[PDB]
Amino acid sequence: LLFADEFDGPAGSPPDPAKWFIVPERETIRNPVEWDKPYNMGRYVTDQEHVFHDGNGNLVIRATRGPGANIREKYASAKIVGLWRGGVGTTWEARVKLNCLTDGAWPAFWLLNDDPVRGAEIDIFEWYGNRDWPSGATVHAKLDGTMFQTQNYPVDSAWHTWRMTWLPSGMYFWQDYEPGKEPFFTVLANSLPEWPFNDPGYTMVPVFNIAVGGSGGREPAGGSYPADMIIDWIRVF
Template identity: 30%
Template sequence: MTLRALTALLATILAAIGSLFTIPALAQTDLAGATSKLTLQVATAMLGERCRRIEAPNPASFASVSLHRTFNDDFDTHPLTGGRWVPHYAGGAAWPEARYWGGDGSDFRRKTSWNGEQQIYVDPRYGGLEATPLGLDPFKVKDGILSIVASRTPPALKAVLFNNEYVSGILTTQGRFSQKYGYFEIRAKIPVGTGVWPAFWMLADDGGWPPEVDIMEGRGQRPGAIVMTTHWRIPETQRVERCGFDFRVEDASTAFHAYGVLWQPDRITYFIDRQPVSEIKVPVGFNDPMYMIVNLAMGSKNFEGVGFVDGQTPETVAFEIDRISAYQIDER
């Protein structure tokens, strides 16, 4: 029996024992695997216009949602070998053509400069300002765990890589997989450190922004801090709004936890270890299928608790990911 299978069996046994002492409606399922079928609990209370935490849930006020799996990657092989992932932003309707398509601006799809990020996303075929691939690979796979590794840019390559302080990695399913409604989940450890900014999130497949669903963002300078946020635009004013919360997961950097979001026609519910923690009425503009993004950014001028990289920032940082899964809601 493999280590992964043994771990899953042990988790199943412990979950069965635990169900004797927990309320069945909110009992934790086996988080180590991505079963073909899944049932989640969601609140049934009426929603206001703003998001809210789900605290001390009453099982009588919850309803079950049945789902079936539509996407899963256990990362038993390199993420770029299966055709599921793209190692950069693919661009779209809202992307400036001049920057996206070439010249010195070709770094546009490999970082978000507006955020003040100090990394560039690379892959083995990327050459920066050179035509020849540099062979830089931020994706490491071992024992079914994907590590997105950020490391300081080699001095000899800094000019070629637009003078970014770090090289790191991003994976997106744009053009490969997108879905309207359903449940989207990552099981991962969340790295920490000054300038460290891991995230699992979603954007509309048409390339526009917002909407944006931030399923999990880590505040590198605040170990155990997990952020879950929804972004949308008010059509009448074009103002971008957001609503979300910070949550404490004390061992987030040392233990694997599942972070997910359930997108239904009427509400968006965020989950930690498949327990609902917050929800929001679906804002305006959530009309198109969304694709998944997982990345390890380094440095931010806007996201509190991350900061810019400095001498205290680790030379290498690893964002460890056990799996990423998606489920669609069963028809009734």
């Protein structure tokens, strides 16, 4: 293995701080439409009521609802960014249970390079609590949203593994991989006019999060909170 977290820490402890950066505040969206204004976007926090080992071998990311005047005040959740960069040829896999498929919630497992001119994003799974957009996987060859391929794919609350293999030829995605299983999504490198993933030394980091509100989650009032993402492990080889 090149990188792994088996999430086997003690109950109530933070994710390993040598492996995970816990994002300390929700992003401020540039030129926001109404759903993306700060008051309509749940907070990200770093405390162990929102991201913590369960002592049973998992990490939990939890979105909560409490008192407040708007979505920002009422809702808090977390986002973790891996402190390890992987490049071409790598196989990324995580075992996850989504107990957070509810109104307003917006869970994802994704890879990121946030370089402002050559960055890119690979969404391995994404589900939208906005009662509108379909769940699925996406390869963004640019961060401005203008050059991507996507595949709708159902996301339910059962335990699954999710795999993305990054090859010179393309990105290949599975749910519950075993030898011989067909990928649910393939994005060939020759299918977009830019492919930063084949630049010399290009690397990406893994991210897990549950966002609340924003364009992807919209109204959380009807949802069931607390809303949990349970992560047994992530492994890269």
